[PDB]
Amino acid sequence: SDKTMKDIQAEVDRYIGQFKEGYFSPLAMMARLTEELGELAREVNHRYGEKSMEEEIGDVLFVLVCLANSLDISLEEAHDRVMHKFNTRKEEGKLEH
Amino acid sequence: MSDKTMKDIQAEVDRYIGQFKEGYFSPLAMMARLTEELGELAREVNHRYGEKPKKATEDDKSMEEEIGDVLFVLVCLANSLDISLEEAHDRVMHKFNT
Amino acid sequence: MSDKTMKDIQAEVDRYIGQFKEGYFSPLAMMARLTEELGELAREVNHRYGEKPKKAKSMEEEIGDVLFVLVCLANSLDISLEEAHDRVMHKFNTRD
Amino acid sequence: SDKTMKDIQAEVDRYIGQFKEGYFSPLAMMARLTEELGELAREVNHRYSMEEEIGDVLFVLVCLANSLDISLEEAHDRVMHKFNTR
Ligand code: NA
Ligand code: NA
Ligand code: NA
Ligand code: NA
C-alpha cells in the first residue's frame, strides 16, 4: 500500500531511462538542486516570512532521488547511515521538467 | 521479508525529533538548515566528480552521508508541515509522465 | 576616477532601502531570499553552460540579483564588503 | 587608497591568475558558490566571522563574473535601474 523507498527510486529511474539520455552529470545535477532549492526557498519565505509547498518539496526530492540513482546509491541505506549517527548542444535537458 | 517505506522514514525521523523538547525548527530556520547541508553535498561532489582537488582518502561512504543529510533535513521540513513525501512524489510523477 | 567604489555600492543600496522605511529583512528571511536568487542564477548557468535548458534573462542580471541581496545582508549586519574582501584576500596570501 | 569595484575584480583576477587551473568552469563555479552559501547559512542560523563567511561568497561570486567577463558594476547598475524604473 505504501511505497518502499527503493521503489520511488525505481519509478524515477523508469522515467529518466525512457529518454535514453542517462542522468545529468553530478555538477549539473547540483545546479538542479540549487535551482529547485531556490524555488522552495521562495515559497517558504512567501508563506512563513511575511498545494504549492507540497510540490516545491517534491521537486527537490525528485532531484535528490535522481542524484541518488545517478551514483547508484540507496537512499534508504543513506538514511540509515545518518540516523545511526544522530542516535549515538550538450544539453539533453529534454529529459526532465 | 520487506524494506523501508517513505512513510516509515518520515515517522522514524519524527519519533527521533519528538524526544527533544525543542521539537522542529521554523520554516525559515529549517531552510537555512537545508542550504547548509546542501553546500556540504556540493563541496563533496565538487571534489569527487568536480574540479576541486581529488581527495587522497580512498572511496568511502562520504557521498552517501552527505546525501543522507540533505534527505534528513528535507524530511524534517516535510514532517514539520504535515506533508507526505510519498504523496509529493506522486505529484511530480504525474505532472511529468502524464 | 569616477568608477563606483564598493563602499558606495553598499551606500547606494542603503539609501534605496531607507525609502520604504520598513527596514532590511531579517537575517534568516534574507538568507532565504539569497538562496532564492542563487538557484535562479543556477538555472541560467545550467542553461548557458550546463545540460538543462530553461523554460518560460541576462546572465549579467542574474549575478546582479545575487550581488544585491548579498549587499543588503552585508549592510543590515553593518558589514564592510570591502573589508570583508581584504580579510579574504589576506587569508589566501598570508601565512604562506 | 579606496577600492573601486573593478579594482576588486582585478585583484581577484590576479590571485586566480597565479595558477595554471585558472577559473573553474561555470558549473564547478556554481558549486563553489553553493558550498560557500552553506557555510554562510550556518553562521546566520547559529547567530540569528560573519565578515569572513560573507567575503567568501563575495569572492566566488567575483570569480564567476571574471571568468565570464561580467562587470559587477554594470551588473549592479542594471539591477539598480530595474528597482528604480517601476
Ligand atoms: Na519547484
Ligand atoms: Na551534507
Ligand atoms: Na538571480
Ligand atoms: Na563561507
Tab-separated table of C-alpha atoms and ligand atoms in Angstrom:
chain	number	residue	atom	x	y	z
A	1	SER	CA	0.000	0.000	0.000
A	2	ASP	CA	2.795	2.430	0.954
A	3	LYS	CA	5.734	2.772	-1.475
A	4	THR	CA	9.087	1.328	-0.416
A	5	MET	CA	11.835	3.949	-0.740
A	6	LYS	CA	13.606	1.593	-3.155
A	7	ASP	CA	10.550	1.779	-5.435
A	8	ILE	CA	10.423	5.571	-5.578
A	9	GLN	CA	13.949	5.240	-6.839
A	10	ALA	CA	12.885	2.580	-9.360
A	11	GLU	CA	9.997	4.700	-10.548
A	12	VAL	CA	12.186	7.752	-11.091
A	13	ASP	CA	14.679	5.554	-12.955
A	14	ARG	CA	11.983	4.234	-15.261
A	15	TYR	CA	11.153	7.822	-16.202
A	16	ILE	CA	14.712	9.105	-16.833
A	17	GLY	CA	15.581	5.871	-18.603
A	18	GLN	CA	12.878	6.458	-21.143
A	19	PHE	CA	14.762	9.334	-22.702
A	20	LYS	CA	17.759	7.101	-23.400
A	21	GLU	CA	19.977	10.002	-22.274
A	22	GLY	CA	21.184	8.818	-18.851
A	23	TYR	CA	21.135	11.155	-15.836
A	24	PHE	CA	22.549	14.688	-15.641
A	25	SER	CA	26.264	14.798	-14.668
A	26	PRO	CA	26.949	15.395	-10.930
A	27	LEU	CA	27.863	19.066	-11.263
A	28	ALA	CA	24.818	19.699	-13.458
A	29	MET	CA	22.615	17.808	-11.001
A	30	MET	CA	23.920	20.090	-8.259
A	31	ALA	CA	22.819	23.137	-10.190
A	32	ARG	CA	19.425	21.458	-10.479
A	33	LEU	CA	19.313	21.054	-6.716
A	34	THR	CA	20.359	24.645	-6.028
A	35	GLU	CA	17.705	25.644	-8.550
A	36	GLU	CA	14.734	23.851	-7.025
A	37	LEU	CA	16.047	24.626	-3.555
A	38	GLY	CA	15.821	28.257	-4.590
A	39	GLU	CA	12.200	27.876	-5.696
A	40	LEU	CA	11.385	26.037	-2.493
A	41	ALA	CA	13.243	28.750	-0.600
A	42	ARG	CA	10.983	31.311	-2.273
A	43	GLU	CA	7.705	29.694	-1.265
A	44	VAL	CA	8.794	29.174	2.334
A	45	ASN	CA	9.599	32.874	2.727
A	46	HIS	CA	6.327	33.601	0.985
A	47	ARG	CA	4.238	31.543	3.387
A	48	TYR	CA	6.296	31.942	6.552
A	49	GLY	CA	8.284	35.171	6.164
A	50	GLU	CA	5.698	37.949	5.628
A	51	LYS	CA	-0.702	22.663	-2.854
A	52	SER	CA	2.383	24.725	-3.710
A	53	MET	CA	4.511	23.845	-0.681
A	54	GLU	CA	3.983	20.129	-1.364
A	55	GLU	CA	5.039	20.464	-4.984
A	56	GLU	CA	8.024	22.706	-4.323
A	57	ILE	CA	9.101	19.982	-1.878
A	58	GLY	CA	8.580	17.110	-4.271
A	59	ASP	CA	10.646	18.963	-6.866
A	60	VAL	CA	13.669	18.917	-4.579
A	61	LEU	CA	13.018	15.309	-3.560
A	62	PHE	CA	12.943	14.389	-7.253
A	63	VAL	CA	16.364	15.849	-7.971
A	64	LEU	CA	17.650	14.270	-4.783
A	65	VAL	CA	16.448	10.847	-5.950
A	66	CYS	CA	17.916	11.449	-9.416
A	67	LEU	CA	21.297	12.255	-7.956
A	68	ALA	CA	20.988	9.170	-5.781
A	69	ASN	CA	20.259	6.858	-8.725
A	70	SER	CA	22.853	8.642	-10.844
A	71	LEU	CA	25.553	7.483	-8.408
A	72	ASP	CA	23.909	4.132	-7.747
A	73	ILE	CA	23.217	4.974	-4.087
A	74	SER	CA	20.388	3.599	-1.975
A	75	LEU	CA	18.522	6.493	-0.464
A	76	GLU	CA	17.306	4.040	2.210
A	77	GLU	CA	20.785	2.849	3.152
A	78	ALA	CA	21.909	6.521	3.195
A	79	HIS	CA	19.070	7.372	5.543
A	80	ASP	CA	20.051	4.536	7.879
A	81	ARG	CA	23.584	5.921	7.943
A	82	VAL	CA	22.509	9.387	9.042
A	83	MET	CA	20.066	8.011	11.607
A	84	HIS	CA	22.744	5.788	13.119
A	85	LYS	CA	24.926	8.851	13.743
A	86	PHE	CA	22.239	11.026	15.336
A	87	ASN	CA	21.306	8.256	17.757
A	88	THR	CA	24.869	7.804	19.045
A	89	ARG	CA	24.111	21.370	-27.558
A	90	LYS	CA	25.381	19.006	-24.845
A	91	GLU	CA	22.092	19.576	-23.030
A	92	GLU	CA	19.716	16.626	-23.086
A	93	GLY	CA	17.502	18.664	-20.788
A	94	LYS	CA	14.622	17.393	-22.888
A	95	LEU	CA	14.813	14.795	-20.154
A	96	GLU	CA	13.354	16.348	-17.002
A	97	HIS	CA	10.886	19.236	-16.375
B	1	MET	CA	10.529	-10.008	4.020
B	2	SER	CA	10.352	-6.218	3.473
B	3	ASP	CA	12.270	-2.911	3.027
B	4	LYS	CA	11.692	0.648	4.350
B	5	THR	CA	8.739	2.769	3.268
B	6	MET	CA	8.938	6.527	2.771
B	7	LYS	CA	6.167	6.920	5.385
B	8	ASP	CA	8.202	4.931	7.890
B	9	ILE	CA	11.283	7.053	7.221
B	10	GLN	CA	9.249	10.175	7.922
B	11	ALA	CA	7.847	8.525	11.032
B	12	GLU	CA	11.269	7.372	12.180
B	13	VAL	CA	12.554	10.932	11.961
B	14	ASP	CA	9.533	12.341	13.833
B	15	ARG	CA	9.956	9.850	16.730
B	16	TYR	CA	13.558	10.978	16.893
B	17	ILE	CA	12.779	14.715	16.879
B	18	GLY	CA	9.884	14.106	19.270
B	19	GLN	CA	12.207	13.210	22.153
B	20	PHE	CA	13.572	16.766	22.182
B	21	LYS	CA	11.580	19.482	23.987
B	22	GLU	CA	12.588	21.992	21.308
B	23	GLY	CA	10.942	19.957	18.553
B	24	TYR	CA	11.137	21.055	14.920
B	25	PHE	CA	12.592	24.294	13.533
B	26	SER	CA	10.621	27.126	11.967
B	27	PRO	CA	10.329	27.060	8.160
B	28	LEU	CA	12.911	29.852	7.621
B	29	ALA	CA	15.353	28.365	10.131
B	30	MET	CA	14.762	24.932	8.679
B	31	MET	CA	15.512	26.424	5.258
B	32	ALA	CA	18.926	27.822	6.234
B	33	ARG	CA	19.496	24.421	7.811
B	34	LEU	CA	18.813	22.815	4.428
B	35	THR	CA	21.011	25.093	2.305
B	36	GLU	CA	23.764	24.362	4.799
B	37	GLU	CA	23.804	20.605	4.241
B	38	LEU	CA	23.299	21.136	0.518
B	39	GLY	CA	26.509	23.154	0.450
B	40	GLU	CA	28.398	20.279	2.054
B	41	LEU	CA	26.919	17.910	-0.501
B	42	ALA	CA	28.010	20.391	-3.153
B	43	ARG	CA	31.519	20.639	-1.746
B	44	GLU	CA	31.845	16.834	-1.794
B	45	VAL	CA	30.673	16.297	-5.381
B	46	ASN	CA	32.865	19.108	-6.499
B	47	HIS	CA	35.741	17.100	-5.007
B	48	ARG	CA	34.770	13.632	-6.227
B	49	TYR	CA	33.370	14.458	-9.681
B	50	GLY	CA	34.000	18.194	-9.771
B	51	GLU	CA	37.001	20.467	-10.240
B	52	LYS	CA	38.372	20.764	-6.677
B	53	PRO	CA	41.351	18.512	-5.945
B	54	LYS	CA	40.652	14.750	-5.887
B	55	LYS	CA	40.702	13.505	-2.282
B	56	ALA	CA	43.644	11.420	-1.047
B	57	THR	CA	41.298	9.290	1.019
B	58	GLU	CA	40.108	6.143	-0.723
B	59	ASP	CA	36.454	5.739	-1.779
B	60	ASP	CA	34.185	5.803	1.266
B	61	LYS	CA	30.560	6.383	2.207
B	62	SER	CA	31.072	10.152	2.291
B	63	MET	CA	28.826	10.706	-0.703
B	64	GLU	CA	26.035	8.745	0.993
B	65	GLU	CA	26.270	10.528	4.314
B	66	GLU	CA	26.300	13.895	2.545
B	67	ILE	CA	23.155	12.891	0.636
B	68	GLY	CA	21.570	11.370	3.696
B	69	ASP	CA	21.880	14.684	5.463
B	70	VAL	CA	20.002	16.620	2.806
B	71	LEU	CA	17.375	13.877	2.741
B	72	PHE	CA	17.172	14.106	6.527
B	73	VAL	CA	16.694	17.867	6.685
B	74	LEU	CA	14.200	17.655	3.824
B	75	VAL	CA	12.255	15.016	5.727
B	76	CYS	CA	12.356	17.210	8.834
B	77	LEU	CA	10.961	20.140	6.863
B	78	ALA	CA	8.308	17.824	5.471
B	79	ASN	CA	7.081	16.370	8.769
B	80	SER	CA	7.065	19.825	10.387
B	81	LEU	CA	4.471	20.850	7.812
B	82	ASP	CA	2.435	17.639	7.903
B	83	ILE	CA	3.458	16.957	4.308
B	84	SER	CA	3.787	13.434	2.931
B	85	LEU	CA	6.845	12.973	0.769
B	86	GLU	CA	5.378	9.790	-0.742
B	87	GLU	CA	2.408	11.840	-1.872
B	88	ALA	CA	4.584	14.730	-3.041
B	89	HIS	CA	6.477	12.193	-5.130
B	90	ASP	CA	3.320	11.059	-6.901
B	91	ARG	CA	2.756	14.704	-7.857
B	92	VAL	CA	5.892	15.089	-9.930
B	93	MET	CA	5.467	11.598	-11.308
B	94	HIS	CA	2.071	12.817	-12.504
B	95	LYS	CA	2.789	16.241	-13.942
B	96	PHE	CA	5.811	14.650	-15.687
B	97	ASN	CA	4.982	11.414	-17.490
B	98	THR	CA	1.285	12.346	-17.539
C	1	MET	CA	38.477	58.339	-11.429
C	2	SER	CA	34.679	58.067	-11.284
C	3	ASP	CA	34.331	54.261	-11.095
C	4	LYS	CA	31.849	53.129	-8.446
C	5	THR	CA	33.631	52.029	-5.287
C	6	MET	CA	32.414	49.110	-3.205
C	7	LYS	CA	31.804	51.287	-0.124
C	8	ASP	CA	29.290	53.340	-2.085
C	9	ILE	CA	27.532	50.442	-3.769
C	10	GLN	CA	26.510	49.350	-0.300
C	11	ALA	CA	25.754	53.045	0.236
C	12	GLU	CA	23.622	53.455	-2.881
C	13	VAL	CA	21.673	50.416	-1.689
C	14	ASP	CA	21.235	51.543	1.940
C	15	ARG	CA	19.750	54.731	0.523
C	16	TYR	CA	17.332	52.844	-1.729
C	17	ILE	CA	16.239	50.779	1.285
C	18	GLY	CA	15.704	53.732	3.641
C	19	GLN	CA	12.927	54.822	1.291
C	20	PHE	CA	10.429	52.051	2.024
C	21	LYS	CA	11.218	52.633	5.722
C	22	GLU	CA	10.272	49.089	6.762
C	23	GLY	CA	13.888	48.130	7.407
C	24	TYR	CA	16.108	45.404	5.816
C	25	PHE	CA	14.855	41.791	6.046
C	26	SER	CA	15.723	39.569	8.994
C	27	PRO	CA	18.961	37.537	8.566
C	28	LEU	CA	17.016	34.299	8.059
C	29	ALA	CA	14.436	35.871	5.778
C	30	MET	CA	17.377	37.481	3.993
C	31	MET	CA	19.147	34.139	3.775
C	32	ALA	CA	16.054	32.583	2.185
C	33	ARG	CA	15.929	35.457	-0.288
C	34	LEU	CA	19.607	34.858	-1.096
C	35	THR	CA	19.313	31.131	-1.861
C	36	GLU	CA	16.306	32.080	-3.991
C	37	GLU	CA	18.305	34.279	-6.340
C	38	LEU	CA	21.232	31.857	-6.252
C	39	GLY	CA	19.186	28.974	-7.599
C	40	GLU	CA	17.807	31.460	-10.088
C	41	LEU	CA	21.369	32.059	-11.146
C	42	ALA	CA	21.880	28.287	-11.151
C	43	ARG	CA	19.021	27.964	-13.623
C	44	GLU	CA	20.809	30.208	-16.182
C	45	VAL	CA	24.267	28.708	-15.714
C	46	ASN	CA	22.802	25.286	-16.334
C	47	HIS	CA	21.197	26.676	-19.467
C	48	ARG	CA	24.017	28.647	-20.996
C	49	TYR	CA	26.804	26.378	-19.771
C	50	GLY	CA	25.092	23.281	-18.438
C	51	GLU	CA	22.965	20.406	-19.645
C	52	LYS	CA	19.457	21.579	-18.765
C	53	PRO	CA	17.655	24.263	-20.837
C	54	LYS	CA	15.378	26.778	-19.044
C	55	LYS	CA	11.644	27.265	-19.674
C	56	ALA	CA	9.214	30.241	-19.695
C	57	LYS	CA	17.009	36.917	-18.701
C	58	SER	CA	20.613	38.109	-18.950
C	59	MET	CA	23.428	36.186	-17.272
C	60	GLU	CA	24.721	39.569	-16.171
C	61	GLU	CA	21.391	40.398	-14.492
C	62	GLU	CA	21.142	37.131	-12.529
C	63	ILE	CA	24.580	37.779	-10.998
C	64	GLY	CA	23.431	41.275	-10.123
C	65	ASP	CA	20.392	39.986	-8.275
C	66	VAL	CA	22.710	37.957	-6.050
C	67	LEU	CA	25.155	40.835	-5.575
C	68	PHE	CA	22.196	42.997	-4.479
C	69	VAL	CA	20.887	40.615	-1.805
C	70	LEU	CA	24.453	39.885	-0.724
C	71	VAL	CA	24.959	43.616	-0.237
C	72	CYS	CA	21.635	44.041	1.540
C	73	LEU	CA	22.614	41.428	4.136
C	74	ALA	CA	26.109	42.906	4.458
C	75	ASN	CA	24.555	46.332	5.211
C	76	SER	CA	21.859	45.137	7.625
C	77	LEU	CA	24.619	43.498	9.644
C	78	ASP	CA	26.805	46.623	9.490
C	79	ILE	CA	29.479	44.962	7.395
C	80	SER	CA	32.072	46.452	5.065
C	81	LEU	CA	32.043	44.303	1.960
C	82	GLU	CA	35.402	45.860	1.049
C	83	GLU	CA	36.850	44.978	4.437
C	84	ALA	CA	35.301	41.527	4.188
C	85	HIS	CA	37.085	41.194	0.856
C	86	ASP	CA	40.572	42.115	2.051
C	87	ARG	CA	40.153	39.801	5.015
C	88	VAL	CA	39.510	37.038	2.491
C	89	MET	CA	42.359	38.115	0.202
C	90	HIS	CA	44.603	38.171	3.268
C	91	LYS	CA	43.889	34.568	4.215
C	92	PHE	CA	44.824	33.475	0.682
C	93	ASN	CA	48.144	35.403	0.723
C	94	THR	CA	49.194	35.405	4.399
C	95	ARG	CA	50.833	32.558	6.365
C	96	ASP	CA	52.130	31.180	3.061
D	1	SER	CA	43.683	54.217	-1.273
D	2	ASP	CA	39.955	53.338	-1.522
D	3	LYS	CA	38.803	50.368	-3.675
D	4	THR	CA	36.603	50.553	-6.792
D	5	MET	CA	34.556	47.521	-7.816
D	6	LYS	CA	36.654	46.951	-10.955
D	7	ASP	CA	39.818	47.081	-8.867
D	8	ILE	CA	38.452	44.402	-6.559
D	9	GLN	CA	37.646	42.223	-9.569
D	10	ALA	CA	41.139	42.828	-10.922
D	11	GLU	CA	42.765	41.977	-7.595
D	12	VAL	CA	40.919	38.664	-7.557
D	13	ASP	CA	41.838	38.039	-11.155
D	14	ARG	CA	45.486	38.416	-10.242
D	15	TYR	CA	45.193	35.784	-7.492
D	16	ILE	CA	43.475	33.192	-9.667
D	17	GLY	CA	45.900	34.158	-12.414
D	18	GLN	CA	48.840	32.905	-10.381
D	19	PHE	CA	47.954	29.255	-11.004
D	20	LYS	CA	47.539	27.089	-14.134
D	21	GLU	CA	43.964	25.885	-13.447
D	22	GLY	CA	42.501	29.383	-13.633
D	23	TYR	CA	38.794	29.874	-13.025
D	24	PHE	CA	36.544	26.857	-12.510
D	25	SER	CA	34.152	26.129	-15.363
D	26	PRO	CA	30.675	27.647	-14.774
D	27	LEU	CA	29.093	24.502	-13.292
D	28	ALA	CA	32.051	23.916	-10.950
D	29	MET	CA	31.999	27.605	-10.043
D	30	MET	CA	28.275	27.321	-9.440
D	31	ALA	CA	29.015	24.576	-6.894
D	32	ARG	CA	31.681	26.717	-5.184
D	33	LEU	CA	29.047	29.370	-4.513
D	34	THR	CA	26.607	26.769	-3.193
D	35	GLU	CA	29.428	25.497	-0.969
D	36	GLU	CA	30.202	28.936	0.470
D	37	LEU	CA	26.471	29.639	0.728
D	38	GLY	CA	26.032	26.700	3.049
D	39	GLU	CA	28.729	27.964	5.374
D	40	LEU	CA	27.258	31.469	5.401
D	41	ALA	CA	23.850	29.930	6.038
D	42	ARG	CA	25.264	28.021	9.021
D	43	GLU	CA	26.548	31.200	10.692
D	44	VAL	CA	23.362	33.184	10.110
D	45	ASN	CA	21.429	30.332	11.737
D	46	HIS	CA	23.925	29.945	14.548
D	47	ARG	CA	23.635	33.651	15.260
D	48	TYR	CA	20.077	34.695	14.382
D	49	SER	CA	33.489	35.898	11.434
D	50	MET	CA	30.330	36.900	9.561
D	51	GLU	CA	32.691	39.152	7.634
D	52	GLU	CA	34.697	36.042	6.632
D	53	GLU	CA	31.797	33.841	5.509
D	54	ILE	CA	30.361	36.768	3.555
D	55	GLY	CA	33.672	37.603	1.996
D	56	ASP	CA	33.884	34.043	0.690
D	57	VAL	CA	30.540	34.228	-1.118
D	58	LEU	CA	31.616	37.584	-2.491
D	59	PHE	CA	34.962	36.121	-3.639
D	60	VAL	CA	33.481	33.184	-5.554
D	61	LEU	CA	30.793	35.476	-6.998
D	62	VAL	CA	33.549	37.755	-8.325
D	63	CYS	CA	35.458	34.785	-9.769
D	64	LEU	CA	32.398	33.675	-11.697
D	65	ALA	CA	31.982	37.174	-13.069
D	66	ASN	CA	35.659	37.447	-14.047
D	67	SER	CA	35.538	34.081	-15.818
D	68	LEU	CA	32.589	35.332	-17.878
D	69	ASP	CA	33.688	38.919	-18.469
D	70	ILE	CA	30.758	40.254	-16.479
D	71	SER	CA	31.397	43.649	-14.927
D	72	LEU	CA	29.872	43.585	-11.482
D	73	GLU	CA	29.456	47.386	-11.667
D	74	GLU	CA	27.404	47.282	-14.832
D	75	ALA	CA	25.510	44.352	-13.293
D	76	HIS	CA	24.814	46.306	-10.121
D	77	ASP	CA	23.576	49.194	-12.262
D	78	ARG	CA	21.211	47.074	-14.349
D	79	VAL	CA	19.793	45.623	-11.157
D	80	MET	CA	19.538	49.070	-9.582
D	81	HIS	CA	17.864	50.555	-12.652
D	82	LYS	CA	15.268	47.776	-12.541
D	83	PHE	CA	14.334	48.669	-8.942
D	84	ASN	CA	14.062	52.346	-9.868
D	85	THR	CA	12.143	52.076	-13.161
D	86	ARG	CA	8.784	50.938	-11.750
E	1	NA	NA	9.866	23.967	-7.745
E	2	NA	NA	25.681	17.281	3.800
E	3	NA	NA	19.008	35.910	-9.788
E	4	NA	NA	31.687	30.905	3.548
